[PDB]
Amino acid sequence: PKIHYRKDYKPSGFIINQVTLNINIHDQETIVRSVLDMDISKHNVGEDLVFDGVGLKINEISINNKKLVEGEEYTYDNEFLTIFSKFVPKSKFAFSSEVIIHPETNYALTGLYKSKNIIVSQCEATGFRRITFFIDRPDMMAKYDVTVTADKEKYPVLLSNGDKVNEFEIPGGRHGARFNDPPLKPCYLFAVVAGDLKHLSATYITKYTKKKVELYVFSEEKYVSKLQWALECLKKSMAFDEDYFGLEYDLSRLNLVAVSDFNVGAMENKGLNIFNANSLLASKKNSIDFSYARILTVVGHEYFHQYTGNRVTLRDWFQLTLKEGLTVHRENLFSEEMTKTVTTRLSHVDLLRSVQFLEDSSPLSHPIRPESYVSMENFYTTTVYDKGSEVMRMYLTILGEEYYKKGFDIYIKKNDGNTATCEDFNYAMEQAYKMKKADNSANLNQYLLWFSQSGTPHVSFKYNYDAEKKQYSIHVNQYTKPDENQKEKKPLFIPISVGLINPENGKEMISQTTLELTKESDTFVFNNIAVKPIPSLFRGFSAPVYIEDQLTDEERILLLKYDSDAFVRYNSCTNIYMKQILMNYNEFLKAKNEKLESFQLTPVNAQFIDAIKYLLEDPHADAGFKSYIVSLPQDRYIINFVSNLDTDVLADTKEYIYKQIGDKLNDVYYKMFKSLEAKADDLTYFNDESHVDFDQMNMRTLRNTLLSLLSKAQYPNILNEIIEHSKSPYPSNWLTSLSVSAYFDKYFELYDKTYKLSKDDELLLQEWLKTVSRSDRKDIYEILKKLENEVLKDSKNPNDIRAVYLPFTNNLRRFHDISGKGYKLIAEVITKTDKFNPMVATQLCEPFKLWNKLDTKRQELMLNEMNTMLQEPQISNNLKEYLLRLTNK
Ligand SMILES: O=C(N[C@@H](C(=O)NO)c1ccc(-c2cc(F)c(F)c(F)c2)cc1)C1CCCC1
Ligand SMILES: [Mg+2]
Ligand SMILES: [Mg+2]
Ligand SMILES: [Mg+2]
Numbered sequence: 038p039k040i041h042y043r044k045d046y047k048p049s050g051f052i053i054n055q056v057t058l059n060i061n062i063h064d065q066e067t068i069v070r071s072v073l074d075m076d077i078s079k080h081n082v083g084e085d086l087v088f089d090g091v092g093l094k095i096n097e098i099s100i101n102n103k104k105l106v107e108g109e110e111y112t113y114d115n116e117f118l119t120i121f122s123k124f125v126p127k128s129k130f131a132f133s134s135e136v137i138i139h140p141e142t143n144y145a146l147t148g149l150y151k152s153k154n155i156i157v158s159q160c161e162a163t164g165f166r167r168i169t170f171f172i173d174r175p176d177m178m179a180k181y182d183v184t185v186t187a188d189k190e191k192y193p194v195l196l197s198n199g200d201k202v203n204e205f206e207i208p209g210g211r212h213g214a215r216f217n218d219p220p221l222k223p224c225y226l227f228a229v230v231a232g233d234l235k236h237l238s239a240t241y242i243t244k245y246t247k248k249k250v251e252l253y254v255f256s257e258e259k260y261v262s263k264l265q266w267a268l269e270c271l272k273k274s275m276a277f278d279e280d281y282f283g284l285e286y287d288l289s290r291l292n293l294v295a296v297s298d299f300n301v302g303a304m305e306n307k308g309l310n311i312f313n314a315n316s317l318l319a320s321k322k323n324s325i326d327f328s329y330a331r332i333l334t335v336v337g338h339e340y341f342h343q344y345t346g347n348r349v350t351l352r353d354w355f356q357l358t359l360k361e362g363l364t365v366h367r368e369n370l371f372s373e374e375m376t377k378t379v380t381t382r383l384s385h386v387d388l389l390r391s392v393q394f395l396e397d398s399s400p401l402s403h404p405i406r407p408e409s410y411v412s413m414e415n416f417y418t419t420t421v422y423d424k425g426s427e428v429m430r431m432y433l434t435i436l437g438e439e440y441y442k443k444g445f446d447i448y449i450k451k452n453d454g455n456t457a458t459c460e461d462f463n464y465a466m467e468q469a470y471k472m473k474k475a476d477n478s479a480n481l482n483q484y485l486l487w488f489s490q491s492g493t494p495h496v497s498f499k500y501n502y503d504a505e506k507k508q509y510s511i512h513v514n515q516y517t518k519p520d521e522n523q524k525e526k527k528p529l530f531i532p533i534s535v536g537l538i539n540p541e542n543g544k545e546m547i548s549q550t551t552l553e554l555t556k557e558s559d560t561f562v563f564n565n566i567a568v569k570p571i572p573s574l575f576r577g578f579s580a581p582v583y584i585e586d587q588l589t590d591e592e593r594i595l596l597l598k599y600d601s602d603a604f605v606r607y608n609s610c611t612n613i614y615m616k617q618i619l620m621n622y623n624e625f626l627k628a629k630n631e632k633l634e635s636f637q638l639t640p641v642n643a644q645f646i647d648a649i650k651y652l653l654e655d656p657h658a659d660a661g662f663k664s665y666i667v668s669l670p671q672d673r674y675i676i677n678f679v680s681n682l683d684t685d686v687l688a689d690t691k692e693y694i695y696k697q698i699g700d701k702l703n704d705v706y707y708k709m710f711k712s713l714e715a716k717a718d719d720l721t722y723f724n725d726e727s728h729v730d731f732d733q734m735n736m737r738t739l740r741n742t743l744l745s746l747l748s749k750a751q752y753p754n755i756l757n758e759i760i761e762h763s764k765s766p767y768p769s770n771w772l773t774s775l776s777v778s779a780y781f782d783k784y785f786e787l788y789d790k791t792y793k794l795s796k797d798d799e800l801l802l803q804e805w806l807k808t809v810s811r812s813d814r815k816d817i818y819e820i821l822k823k824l825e826n827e828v829l830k831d832s833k834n835p836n837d838i839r840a841v842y843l844p845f846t847n848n849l850r851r852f853h854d855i856s857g858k859g860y861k862l863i864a865e866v867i868t869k870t871d872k873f874n875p876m877v878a879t880q881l882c883e884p885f886k887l888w889n890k891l892d893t894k895r896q897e898l899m900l901n902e903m904n905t906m907l908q909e910p911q912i913s914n915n916l917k918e919y920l921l922r923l924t925n926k
């Protein structure tokens with residue numbers, strides 16, 4: 038297995054200036070002819086010319102129109118085409134080839150493949166080499182002239198990057214289109230699409246240059262009525278980049294295309310963004326509410342790459358976070374502005390501190406800029422994306438909006454049209470830092486440790502108040518646990534956004550303040566503090582760290598009720614829950630270990646329950662925030678705090694805590710469920726796809742959260758509410774009715790009803806599958822077998838496979854059945870999927886990421902399944918590398 042090392046970067050001995058492609062799609066094969074106009078670089082030392090080319094069937098290869106012969110002048114081993122240096126010219130030359138590829142049977146969905154009746158490419162990271170020979174790395178920038186030909190009846194719409202400069206008829210019912218894209222680009226941004234596509238379109242006029250941009254959104258004909266929201270999101274994305282960043286789109290046209298089979302969410306190919314249908318298509322009758330934020334996020338994300346990734350690209354793949362972390366940060370700013378709901382930021386933090394913190398304490402832990410890789414298909418991680426986004430966001434917190442915008446414009450202006458590295462971005466931020474500090478000696482050298490140091494820092498506090506001196510001090514310490522990447526961890530530049538709350542009136546005691554912690558510890562002192570405050574720490578979640586606030590539950594309750602910052606309120610609630618969970622977990626664990634016949638559990642704090650009631654009953658409080666406070670922290674968040682976690686004991690712990698709170702608040706929950714109905718389920722705009730109300734969707738989230746709590750509690754006659762909910766026009770409601778009916782004898786009646794409502798829309802059916810998969814059913818294993826035999830079958834669609842299996846893996850009690858049968862089931866699915874899609878097989882390994890954090894019996898059971906998968910003779914490179922790292926081999 039070849040390991041690539043970040044420190045080994047060296048420019049190529051060759052240059053590719055022009056790519057001229059002819060892609061001829063036929064029924065049983067696709068023929069690709071390519072001429073590369075090439076040159077010798079200043080770094081050349083007379084080496085062999087080696088092209089990447091994976092799984093290509095050679096018809097011919099030539100240099101300057103002289104056909105080369107295998108064995109004598111070149112070798113090809115299905116991965117590398119080597120032309121021996123004695124046959125490589127010393128000045129500008131043309132390399133040409135004709136190869137045969139087979140998109141129909143390309144079920145790995147990389148390179149050129151068929152998704153239903155659409156031919157589509159996916160070239161990031163190293164997929165272009167599956168289409169034709171290339172030096173397949175992002176610093177090999179070239180011009181592209183691309184012709185596609187195909188049967189006209191089957192493939193009337195032909196698309197590639199750049200301007201469509203010719204369309205022509207071909208004998209035999211064929212036709213072609215030629216696309217010329219003069220600006221230099223890396224090959225991972227090449228794309229082609231051919232299909233019987235239908236569209237919606239609009240014209241957007243840029244803010245400053247007043248350029249007309251044509252916007253097109255495409256899908257198969259069946260789903261063309263689901264394209265409206267995506268088009269609105271694209272217009273919103275363009276306006277946001279103009280308004281916040283002053284950045285306009287540079288091209289005459291932007292196409293977005295939905296396909297049914299896609300490994301991830303979407304891809305930013307220049308002028309031709311390609312999407313998983315689940316991240317582009319929605320309608321109010323056929324989609325759950327989550328689709329609306331998802332489409333907004335993903336359309337925005339791909340659009341923002343036009344600058345951060347496309348116009349400014351990567352020198353090499355180790356710089357991935359420079360485009361992905363920065364584009365996620367841009368998407369987060371956009372979505373926060375578009376939704377105007379505090380839950381947008383909270384949802385990103387909730388994901389980071391569960392999924393990403395788990396990764397960062399697992400054997401897979403890596404910094405946002407890794408030092409090495411084997412599989413690029415395994416590099417696209419929540420660490421690179423989501424911790425990367427938080428590292429990119431910390432620059433905005435440190436600089437403030439005005440100087441952040443100044444620094445970002447420096448980055449764009451200096452690097453536009455070129456490759457870049459993480460250091461280029463830090464340099465631009467540093468220039469703004471010097472301006473803000475009015476000190477040309479200020480620097481951000483320490484900040485670079487956020488790119489190289491793995492693991493989550495822990496930040497802890499101690500406080501002191503002198504009533505006579507009116508002087509308050511916050512003593513802060515940071516620590517990162519040593520791991521496989523650094524034996525000694527260095528202190529980071531940690532910005533701590535803080536407020537000081539007066540506990541008597543709830544008011545702010547100081548102005549906006551961001552503490553800059555740059556040492557292992559520091560003491561921050563505040564004078565003229567008239568009363569002992571309660572500190573509001575890491576406002577907005579100002580650094581990606583474990584926060585140890587050292588506050589009492591009384592202090593946390595005061596913040597939960599009265600603080601101004603949504604995150605600190607949410608975090609104070611989280612911390613109250615965590616203290617309770619850890620205490621009850623240990624009480625249950627001791628009773629299990631000691632086989633006690635009787636024992637005591639510490640009750641939930643009654644003032645905390647009163648505080649939840651107070652917030653729930655406040656009509657001016659936010660419905661989305663309310664849904665968070667009645668929900669315990671995610672299992673994957675909890676697990677970072679418990680060694681040898683017994684999942685059954687955790688399930689009993691959560692059940693006790695939910696029952697304690699419900700025993701006091703269920704009548705409140707029911708009253709709110711009923712009173713929220715009118716606004717939550719308002720149908721005024723049901724047939725307007727342009728009208729999306731994020732507050733209303735949060736009201737539905739709150740109702741559906743309360744309904745779940747009341748259903749689990751067997752609240753009297755709640756089944757009546759469940760049945761009525763199943764008649765709602767909103768899929769979020771009627772699918773909720775299925776999941777909450779799991780606790781009643783009506784489950785299979787609702788299973789059949791909602792199946793019939795879902796079966797005729799491909800994406801809705803996938804949402805139905807997820808709802809079944811995560812249903813809290815004692816017979817879930819039998820239900821999964823039924824889904825396999827009746828619905829999923831041998832589908833190779835990643836959306837189908839992920840929908841059936843991933844939600845079930847979050848069933849704490851059932852997936853972690855002590856027999857190991859859930860681990861065995863998912864391992865069988867992984868091995869089956871690995872035969873045709875290694876990238877998706879590795880995604881399906883997700884539940885194993887926490888294996889070494891569980892109790893010793895479950896550790897053994899998971900390790901046995903991972904070792905079984907590793908022993909499969911036909912294991913893919915992707916899956917083998919991933920499991921070897923995960924099991925510490
Ligand atoms: O969709 C997303 N991410 C995209 C993305 O960054 N889009 O900008 C993304 C991820 C992995 C690949 C990728 C890599 C490979 F190595 C492959 F082989 C391959 F097939 C595909 C391609 C695109 C989520 C949702 C929005 C942002 C996070
Ligand atoms: Mg092949
Ligand atoms: Mg405008
Ligand atoms: Mg299908």
Ligand SMILES: [Mg+2]
Binds near residue numbers: 926
């Ligand atoms: Mg290891």
Ligand SMILES: [Zn+2]
Binds near residue numbers: 305342360361364
């Ligand atoms: Zn991206």
